[PDB]
């Protein structure tokens, strides 16, 4: 479960990169948060 | 030479 | 011998299709697979030693017309491998047992030429599950593609036998399981139709921005890969539809250059486009309502049940393209 | 054609025909009568010509440059989405109306 | 001759009784089929045959063609490895000649095990047939498969086959003890996991490859043999995406390690020099992501046909 | 900067995803922090 909650982490994160590829900081600072909350949810 | 032929 | 040389020299492509690998847009996965498998052996080959053995099958599987045989041309273009492309047309012969001769002298020819890769474009049509085809065809064909991929005095060493197929639910299950890695390419999401769209305007002048792709990417949602290369086919034709219904040019800016404008404009001259000079002409840049226009007119090209039977396979057999 | 692999060579001599006398105009009248949406049909008529006028159309190493592929049909329900792709403008020819009645 | 004489092997592929998983009584059938024969000649005299032939069938991926490897490594026989494709021509009467040749020069170096690989695909029921191929070879072949007592050196007919149910009756009758190689079990599938990473340094226990033997249940050994090959190529996905490495321990030798470590100096893989790399250690998350990703293979009505000739003629 | 600042947060949640391919949590939970706290630098 853990494993795959780190998975998930790195998912948002990945997305996230992706989305500053076009600027969009809304996105963003979305995806980076609700990885980071769920890297404390571990 | 013995050649194939093909049926329906 | 040196007759069947004569018919299979054919085959051994020499031409290089210069499709690299970032003209492949989406697709990170796919990719990942084929650089570890075709690109890596070859440039690193001291790696591979004692139980870590490239790997000798690879079968890409998906709806039509979203990737398939274009990332076999950028395998052969990128993979300084020999690239054997044969088909049905190429194994088929007249004449009792040419279709396993041939097939046996096919694979002899990649093993005297390794490292080798043989694309066997559409195998959904010599490989047909085997319950209801016809003895010699079915049986033989069949039968020495099987005895020849992995079998017993054979050595599939150096070697990959690629694959593509559009129906791969009536595929043999002995092939299912030779090919080792059924991975799967989908329709394009939305970054890689935004990707699309500016790989396919190419150099051309155009007035869109990136929130213009990002629109019609947004627009396009069921689109595979084809669909998008001939919308962009349509609206790159645009400007050539106002340069012809153009009663009245006009002057701008190297000497001389006119374009076309409404009727009565400032220095709206009336004449058409065969009265105006060679390379003189100026057309109308790339302006969004081309993009709109064709977008309106160009309908997509697969349906949503195909697609349930894609998903049945991949859920029961295969991997995932991303 | 009867003998065995014989209607395909015939599919890719076409297609080389056109290519060796190019600009060229290939016109398949009827093709919903050659290409059936491969769920039923037999193995060799069925798979083999389908599939070499499928490759043979864009594929790898084919180079369909300066050739063009007519094709009409009645049936255009009946035809199979891998080469309802290939042909990429489906223009529909409909019913005439009252200017194109006057003309005729 | 100089055209089936590309039937005999030489290469003699190094697999021994001990990596096929399981599959005892196959073994001990072979066994005495094949060992026994030789081993102690004087035994078999008066009514005490030896087997002319032997089936085996089971789905596909199970074992018969390796098993078939692992004879052919330990038999020390000769070893002819036909298929239809060195049988069958276009002249008639030469799908006569070259059957009745195959024989004779199995008798010219006995012992002979011969292994006529996917029989199916020789033998085909003769309703639908073409005349050359299908009724000559057919006919011959019976005929030369009905040699019961002058055959007791030389000749084990192995075999091989996915469609057992599609054989024809007079061929089934030919292969005397038809074998069912079926899906393996606990105890082969941990076997096959310890094999098949062989000698690679690997921090699993006894419990680890007991875990994922657990954890198959439904691969065959081909499966098995590819999840093993995809968790070894894990370290080097796991040195690609490398942004960091960092020295460890006969001067310099540098692994991958996350931003900022002991030691932890950026850079890629590339930029390290030849061997004074690290290649990171095998985990059991390598194999967990390696059985997350690879599916099965077998269909399960496949097997209900399957059972359906076993208890039918098996 | 900025053109840059967007870059280095990629840079950093990159790093993050790298570090988590080891469970170090640690360096996560920082670097995807430290960009986050720069997105709204921007
Ligand atoms: N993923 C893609 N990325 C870039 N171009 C693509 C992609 N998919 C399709 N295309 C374009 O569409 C055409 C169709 O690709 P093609 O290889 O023939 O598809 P396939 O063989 O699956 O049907 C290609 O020539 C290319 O021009
Ligand atoms: N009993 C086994 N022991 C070891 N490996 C096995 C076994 N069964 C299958 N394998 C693995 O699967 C591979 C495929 O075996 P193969 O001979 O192709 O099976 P078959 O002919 O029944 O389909 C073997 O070479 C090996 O990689
Ligand atoms: F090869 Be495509 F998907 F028709
Ligand atoms: F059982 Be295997 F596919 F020959
Ligand atoms: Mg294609
Ligand atoms: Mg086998």
Same mark, same amino acid.
């Given at each position: 479960?853990?494993?795959? $909650?780190?998975?998930?982490?790195? $998912?948002?994160?990945?997305?996230?990169?992706?989305?500053?590829?076009?600027?969009?900081?809304?996105?963003?600072?979305?995806?980076?948060? $609700?990885?980071?909350?769920?890297?404390?949810?571990? | 030479?013995?050649?194939?032929?093909?049926?329906? | 011998?040196?007759?069947?040389?004569?018919?299979?020299?054919?085959?051994?492509?020499?031409?290089?299709?210069?499709?690299?690998?970032?003209? #492949?847009?989406?697709? &990170?996965?796919?990719? &990942?697979?084929?650089?570890?498998?075709?690109?890596?052996?070859?440039?690193?080959?001291?790696?591979?030693?004692?139980?870590?053995?490239?790997?000798?099958?690879?079968?890409?599987?998906?709806?039509?017309?979203?990737?398939?045989?274009?990332?076999?041309?950028? @395998?052969?273009?990128?993979?300084?491998?020999?690239?054997?492309?044969?088909?049905?047309?190429?194994?088929?012969?007249?004449?009792?047992?040419?279709?396993?001769?041939?097939?046996?002298?096919?694979?002899?020819?990649?093993?005297?030429?390794?490292?080798?890769?043989?694309?066997?474009?559409?195998?959904?049509?010599?490989?047909?599950?085997?319950?209801?085809?016809?003895?010699?065809?079915?049986?033989?064909?069949?039968?020495?593609?099987?005895?020849?991929?992995?079998?017993?005095?054979?050595?599939?060493?150096? @070697?990959?036998?690629?694959?593509?197929?559009?129906?791969?639910?009536?595929?043999?299950?002995?092939?299912?399981?030779?090919?080792?890695?059924?991975?799967?390419?989908?329709?394009?999401?939305?970054?890689?139709?935004?990707?699309?769209?500016?790989?396919? #305007?190419?150099?051309?002048?155009?007035?869109?921005?990136?929130?213009?792709?990002?629109?019609?990417?947004?627009?396009?949602?069921?689109?595979?890969?084809?669909?998008?290369? @001939?919308?962009v086919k349509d609206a790159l034709m645009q400007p050539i539809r106002k340069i012809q219904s153009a009663t009245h040019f006009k002057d701008v800016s190297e000497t001389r250059k006119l374009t076309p404008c409404s009727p009565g404009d400032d220095g709206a001259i009336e004449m058409s486009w065969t009265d105006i000079e060679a390379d003189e002409?100026?057309?109308?840049?790339?302006?969004?309502?081309?993009?709109?226009?064709?977008?309106?007119?160009?309908?997509?090209? #697969?349906?949503?049940?195909?697609?349930?039977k894609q998903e049945q396979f991949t859920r029961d057999f295969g991997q995932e393209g991303n």
């Open positions: 479960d853990r494993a795959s $909650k780190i998975e998930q982490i790195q $998912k948002l994160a990945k997305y996230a990169i992706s989305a500053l590829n076009y600027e969009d900081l809304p996105t963003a600072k979305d995806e980076l948060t $609700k990885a980071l909350d769920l890297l404390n949810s571990i | 030479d013995e050649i194939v032929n093909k049926v329906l | 011998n040196k007759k069947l040389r004569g018919a299979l020299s054919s085959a051994i492509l020499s031409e290089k299709p210069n499709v690299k690998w970032e003209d #492949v847009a989406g697709l &990170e996965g796919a990719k &990942e697979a084929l650089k570890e498998a075709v690109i890596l052996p070859v440039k690193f080959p001291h790696l591979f030693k004692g139980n870590r053995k490239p790997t000798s099958g690879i079968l890409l599987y998906g709806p039509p017309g979203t990737g398939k045989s274009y990332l076999a041309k950028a @395998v052969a273009t990128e993979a300084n491998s020999t690239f054997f492309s044969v088909s049905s047309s190429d194994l088929v012969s007249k004449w009792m047992g040419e279709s396993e001769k041939l097939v046996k002298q096919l694979f002899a020819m990649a093993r005297e030429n390794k490292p080798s890769i043989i694309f066997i474009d559409e195998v959904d049509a010599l490989t047909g599950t085997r319950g209801e085809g016809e003895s010699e065809a079915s049986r033989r064909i069949k039968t020495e593609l099987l005895v020849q991929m992995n079998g017993v005095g054979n050595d599939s060493q150096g @070697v990959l036998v690629l694959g593509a197929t559009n129906i791969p639910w009536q595929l043999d299950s002995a092939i299912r399981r030779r090919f080792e890695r059924r991975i799967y390419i989908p329709l394009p999401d939305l970054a890689a139709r935004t990707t699309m769209f500016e790989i396919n #305007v190419g150099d051309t002048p155009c007035v869109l921005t990136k929130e213009d792709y990002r629109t019609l990417g947004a627009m396009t949602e069921g689109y595979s890969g084809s669909d998008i290369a @001939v919308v002409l100026k057309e109308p840049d790339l302006t969004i309502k081309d993009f709109l226009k064709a977008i309106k007119s160009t309908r997509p090209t #697969v349906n949503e049940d195909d697609l349930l």
